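Supplementary Note 2. Why include the ligand at all?

Several targets in our set were suspected to adopt different conformations when bound, so apo predictions alone were not considered sufficient. For every target with a known small-molecule partner we therefore ran a joint prediction. The input for decane is given below.
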Amino acid sequence: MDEHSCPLEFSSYGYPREEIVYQWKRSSVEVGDTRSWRLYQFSFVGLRNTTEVVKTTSGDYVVMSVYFDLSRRMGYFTIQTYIPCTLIVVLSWVSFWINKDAVPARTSLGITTVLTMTTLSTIARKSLPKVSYVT
Amino acid sequence: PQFSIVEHRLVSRNVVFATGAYPRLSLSFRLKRNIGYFILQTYMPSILITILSWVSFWINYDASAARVALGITTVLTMTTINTHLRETLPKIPYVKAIDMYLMGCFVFVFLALLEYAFVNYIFFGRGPQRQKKLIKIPDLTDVNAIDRWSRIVFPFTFSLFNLVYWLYYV
Amino acid sequence: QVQLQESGGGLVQGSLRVSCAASGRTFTTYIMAWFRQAPGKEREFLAAMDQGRIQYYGDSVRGRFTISRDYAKNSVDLQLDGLRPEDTAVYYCAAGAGFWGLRTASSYHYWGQGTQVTVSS
Amino acid sequence: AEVVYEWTREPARSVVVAEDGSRLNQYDLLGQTVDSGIVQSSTGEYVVMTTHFHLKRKIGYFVIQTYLPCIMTVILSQVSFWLNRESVPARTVFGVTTVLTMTTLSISARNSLPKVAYATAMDWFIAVCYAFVFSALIEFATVNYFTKRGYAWDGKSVVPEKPKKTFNSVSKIDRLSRIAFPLLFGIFNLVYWATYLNR
Amino acid sequence: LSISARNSLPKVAYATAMDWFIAVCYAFVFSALIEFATVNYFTKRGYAWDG
Ligand SMILES: *[C@@H]1O[C@H](CO)[C@@H](O[C@@H]2O[C@H](CO)[C@@H](O[C@@H]3O[C@H](CO[C@H]4O[C@H](CO)[C@@H](O)[C@H](O[C@H]5O[C@H](CO)[C@@H](O)[C@H](O)[C@@H]5O)[C@@H]4O)[C@@H](O)[C@H](O[C@H]4O[C@H](CO)[C@@H](O)[C@H](O)[C@@H]4O)[C@@H]3O)[C@H](O)[C@H]2NC(C)=O)[C@H](O)[C@H]1NC(C)=O
Ligand SMILES: CCCCCCCC/C=C/CCCCCCCC(=O)O[C@H](COC(=O)CCCCCCCCCCCCCCC)COP(=O)(O)OC[C@@H](O)CO
Ligand SMILES: CCCCCCCC(=O)OC[C@H](COP(=O)(O)O[C@@H]1[C@H](O)[C@H](O)[C@@H](OP(=O)(O)O)[C@H](OP(=O)(O)O)[C@H]1O)OC(=O)CCCCCCC
Ligand SMILES: CCCCCCCCCCCC(=O)OC[C@H](COP(=O)([O-])O)OC(=O)CCCCCCCCCCC
Ligand SMILES: CCCCCCCCCCCC(=O)OC[C@H](COP(=O)([O-])O)OC(=O)CCCCCCCCCCC
Ligand SMILES: CCCCCCCCCCCCCCCC(=O)O
Ligand SMILES: CCCCCCCCCCCCCCCC(=O)O
Ligand SMILES: CCCCCCCCCCCCCCCC
Ligand SMILES: CCCCCCCCCCCCCCCC
Ligand SMILES: CCCCCCCCCC
Ligand SMILES: CCCCCCCCCC
Ligand SMILES: CCCCCCCCCC
Ligand SMILES: CCCCCCCCCC
Ligand SMILES: CCCCCCCCCC
Ligand SMILES: CCCCCCCCCC
Ligand SMILES: CCCCCCCCCC
Ligand SMILES: CCCCCC
Ligand SMILES: CCCCCC
Ligand SMILES: CCCCCC
Ligand SMILES: CCCCCC
Ligand SMILES: [Cl-]
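The joint prediction is reproduced in token form.
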């Protein structure tokens, strides 16, 4: 359910603010068909341009930024992780309706559901980087 | 490591395009693929799993949990072998020789499981009705006869299939 | 359900504009086209515009009519200039993926109601 | 106004594909359409020359690797209806293993594609097959719920008539499901393929 | 294990020490299962020993 505002910054490498100054035009950032792009997991919400001054060792430089707002789409991840996990939970619920004397059946059902969860957890993380916080 | 160069050939000819005729040389190689790696990888585990699938025929009809577990495990192992094969090849739209072999092994283990399914159905469905009322194929009344017939026939049929496959592809 | 709502003038003595807005489905990623069909005539291709803002026109209407698209609003507009009394006809808005087509009506899987246009001298 | 592109020959024959050279594995090149137009940008109007190559995906690979495994999994799940209702661990093994096989197939099917955020025909087929397998498991659960006694037919005694040691009756649920499940799965296959093939 | 052993190796056409060890281990496991089948073939009674 995450949303991001990815930047694209540019400036003059050599010439400081006293030598080169950049400026956005009236309609500077144009786009064509926004949702015909290669964004499969994301949808383009909009964009906004800005300008600032960044101080470095060589000097102060005029930095020109364009932020693109992207919103993730739920379809692929809903197919991949959410539906199987809920289905395995329901499969675990099925054990409650089996006769309690069916010891191997119910034990195998429970432990197998716990296995398929370990596997689903393992594969749910594959698309992500190895971040150290809970999503 | 995987191929042996049977022969190589040199050809000289002319090729015509819209802009003119150009000289062409062709250096061609014929490569024969080595089979030992695939024997170690895919063929021999499939044969061994198909052989293990016949162990159910020596178990009594009332050991439903054991026989069903053995059949299901053999089917699962065949599926895993096929999975690990397909993950290391392109998405060609036709069946290969190894596909033919793995599909045959799957058919054999699936029929082995269906054999116990048929035996269990015959016993626990027709026995009460039958008692209330009261190589050639075996008598359908006797589950022991069906099991013995399966014991004799499944290895023989698998050997015949292997002979036909290897003679065709070698 | 997916629809294409067409609007524009019906009578002229001339310049005219025909708009076609799409709802129920995102037609941005589909090639969008304009066709003509007078009575006793087969549906003929007038104009089209692709996802990449590339415009195609028929030889009969090259340089006269102009096609434009608003992808944010999901609409295709057609400005008709130099209208003549041979031009009177029903104008259809179409959209689809151009497969074996981009100039044939069969390749477009979505169509509008159509709008009548008449020129009187 | 400065440079204009035209096709050398007529547009249809101005793009030629060599018959011997074709490196498509999972596609068939039906043909090519050739056209030209203009593009309007901030800098000006530019002539663009376009060639659309029409490609049709080949279904054989996916039929071999996804559809047949799913169909065999559904058939294997439906096989459990023919076992006696007292084979609780065996039928539970059938249901659970078929459910996990369908889950693994669903996971592995999407690996071929890019991670698009909408369902495909293969996804719908996998969903229906999972529904069939899980419904078979629910059917076994109902049969076990209505099962009375925990021992099967001995082999020699004579089931008296419902209308000494009693024995469980063959489940009406099993008897109905044996014909209902394959028939419904076949109807679903008919409708699905008739819907998606001639398109 | 046998399938996954040679993942990070060239597809050589001969058996290695790894292959021989895995083959012998698989033979041991297979013979254990066959031994259980042989034992079960001679089991007369379907009930275990009550305490
Ligand atoms: C791997 O797979 C590839 C793909 O199939 C194989 O490629 C082909 O190999 C064959 C032979 O191995 C090639 O055919 C040969 O061409 C030579 C040279 O032809 C040139 O020069 C001639 C003299 O100047 C000229 O006449 C030829 O022109 C046409 O002429 C012939 C005769 O009229 C006509 O039939 C052809 O259509 C030619 O196009 C050509 O410009 C030729 O000398 C070879 O001939 C043998 O047989 C003839 C029988 O009449 C005999 O007279 C000759 O003396 C000679 O014994 C042969 O035709 C073919 O061109 C290759 N194709 C491609 C696309 O490269 C490859 O061989 C395989 N190799 C391996 C190792 O697997
Ligand atoms: C681990 C796995 C083990 C499984 C192994 C089990 C063993 C038994 C299976 C053998 C499969 C044989 C493979 C056959 C090849 C696969 C089929 C195939 O691709 O052939 C094409 C027809 O396809 C097609 O109609 C596409 C549709 C085919 C779908 C067939 C499924 C039928 C399902 C019916 C429901 C039954 C329900 C019963 C329940 C009781 C021929 O066309 P054409 O050359 O022009 O190419 C055009 C282009 O699309 C590429 O083909
Ligand atoms: C998702 C949840 C859905 C819940 C569905 C709930 C479905 C439901 O409520 O089942 C009811 C029952 C099931 O049948 P069922 O085979 O279990 O019938 C009982 C069973 O045979 C016992 O073995 C009998 O005792 P015994 O062997 O002689 O000792 C007992 O006889 P008695 O005690 O009467 O003398 C029988 O009643 O009747 C139907 O057949 C309709 C099945 C329609 C199934 C339609 C399937 C398409
Ligand atoms: C797409 C096509 C759908 C077609 C719909 C029908 C599905 C097949 C169900 C057939 C049911 C049937 O006819 O049973 C025949 C007999 C038992 O019934 P009866 O006619 O003797 O009273 O039983 C027999 O003679 C053989 C029973 C074998 C049972 C053991 C093998 C289990 C196979 C499972 C297949 C899913
Ligand atoms: C989530 C899964 C639930 C399954 C419940 C049983 C019904 C299965 C079909 C309807 C459910 C479904 O997911 O259909 C998938 C596709 C249609 O997808 P879409 O084209 O609507 O996006 O299906 C097709 O392409 C064709 C469907 C054929 C329906 C008619 C025959 C049904 C036979 C009996 C089934 C019990
Ligand atoms: C989480 C759901 C898992 C599926 C569990 C299915 C259980 C099926 C058993 C239904 C028993 C219904 C008993 C009521 C009988 C009656 O009508 O009087
Ligand atoms: C392919 C492997 C199948 C498993 C075969 C297991 C055979 C176990 C039974 C051994 C029988 C010993 C010889 C006959 C004994 C007897 O009939 O008295
Ligand atoms: C080269 C012909 C195209 C493939 C046609 C379908 C092949 C089906 C093979 C299935 C064989 C499995 C049974 C083996 C014998 C029991
Ligand atoms: C180049 C020669 C390759 C030969 C590979 C043959 C491998 C299979 C040999 C053993 C098959 C026996 C099956 C017996 C089933 C009971
Ligand atoms: C491994 C083959 C064993 C053959 C045993 C002979 C039949 C014994 C039936 C009692
Ligand atoms: C039991 C026969 C197994 C298959 C033998 C195939 C030999 C092919 C020629 C070497
Ligand atoms: C053309 C592929 C031949 C594969 C051999 C199948 C033999 C089946 C024998 C029952
Ligand atoms: C539309 C969501 C479909 C989820 C997969 C099918 C689950 C079937 C459970 C009976
Ligand atoms: C039992 C009904 C199965 C229907 C399969 C139809 C497949 C058609 C492929 C052309
Ligand atoms: C797993 C491939 C190697 C198998 C070695 C021989 C197995 C003998 C089983 C009795
Ligand atoms: C595949 C090897 C099977 C070995 C079975 C041994 C049984 C011997 C009974 C006399
Ligand atoms: C009807 C099932 C047949 C299985 C082969 C013995
Ligand atoms: C593979 C062993 C066959 C035994 C037949 C009695
Ligand atoms: C898709 C489930 C079918 C159930 C028929 C009783
Ligand atoms: C919805 C599945 C029902 C199974 C038979 C009662
Ligand atoms: Cl390709």
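The pocket of ligand 1 is lined by residues B 7-9, 11, 13-14, 26, 28, 30 (CB under 6 Å). The helical segments of chain A are 75-93, 103-124. Comparable summaries for the other entries are listed in the accompanying table.
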